[PDB]
Amino acid sequence: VGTHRFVQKVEEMVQNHMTYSLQDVGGDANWQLVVEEGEMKVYRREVEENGIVLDPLKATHAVKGVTGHEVCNYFWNVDVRNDWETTIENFHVVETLADNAIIIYQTHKRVWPASQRDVLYLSVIRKIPALTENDPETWIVCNFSVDHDSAPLNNRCVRAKINVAMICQTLVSPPEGNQEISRDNILCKITYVANVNPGGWAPASVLRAVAKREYPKFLKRFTSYVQEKTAGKPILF
Structure with missing residues (x-):
């Protein structure tokens, strides 16, 4: 855990996500399930502030035969962005x-x-x-x-x-x-x-x-891309 100038706000963002973003929704009445496909569930919460659309989006997914390390590597890794990003x-x-x-x-x-x-x-x-x-x-x-x-x-x-x-x-x-x-x-x-x-x-x-179209489309392309990049290879845990 680092020492660069943005270190405290990184940890605060990370901590807010750990504490707030992992909460189960939909079982929450302020959110609605707006898209489902296979194991992917996309929820939205409808909000505007001063006339402007800020709708928080939340999606859950379950992806067989890959690890969280592998998924996060591919999402973060700038070297491989062109392959899945549209x-x-x-x-x-x-x-x-x-x-x-x-x-x-x-x-x-x-x-x-x-x-x-x-x-x-x-x-x-x-x-x-x-x-x-x-x-x-x-x-x-x-x-x-x-x-x-x-x-x-x-x-x-x-x-x-x-x-x-x-x-x-x-x-x-x-x-x-x-x-x-x-x-x-x-x-x-x-x-x-x-x-x-x-x-x-x-x-x-x-x-x-x-x-409603872009997020589910991004999530299915990205995750199925991780599946084929890792298929048949040693597992990076």
Whole structure:
């Protein structure tokens, strides 16, 4: 756990996610289940602040034969982004803060009725130890908006403000024999949270319709991509 300038806000974001984002929803009446497919359940909570659509999004998923480490590596790892990411025009790493922490500038593809959004965020990958060996360890990627002098607001893009987490816990079953653990004995439990301010204005109706398609589509592509990248390979726990 680091010493760079953003260390305290990383830990605070991480801690808020550990404490708030893992809460069971839908069994919660302020959230609604808006999409389901296989093991993926996408929930939304409807909110605007000063006329603007901020709808927190939360998704759960269960993915056989991958670990939380593997899922978080692929989500965080900038080297492999082009392979699964579909909504990104361009991007670059603005600064490396640590081995597990970078600041990324990116522009998105044009989703009507809007010019492009850009986003400027700190992306960190963390392992949260289990309090006991009776519990799962958690891997988390936290992506949250920060400022950087090398990346001022420009007049070509609308600056979105994001707070996103991909939170993964790995359930492992049995050496069956005793014998040996394969990808058959493992399941990654995923919680993915997104709190995005688009930063301009668009009709509430289309913004909710675009989110309803884009998030499930992203989650299914990304997770099935992790499955095929890891199939037949030694397990990275």
